[PDB]
Curated annotation (Swiss-Prot):
It comes from the Eukaryota. Disulfide bonds join 6-20, 14-31, 33-42. Residues 2-43 form the EGF-like domain. Residues 48-53 are annotated as: Not required for full biological activity. The gene is Egf. This is Epidermal growth factor.
Amino acid sequence: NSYPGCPSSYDGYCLNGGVCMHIESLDSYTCNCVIGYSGDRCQTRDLRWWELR
């Protein structure tokens, strides 16, 4: 499952211009981005239609 969360443990898990959201699969934290960026945050500065609507 996935859940919105981002404690103060870190600081700027998302770069370029993304939003932070937590995961419950590995109790890990991740970050979403926009066209021209994705991955664990915004590292994959690529196109790659990875979204809809």
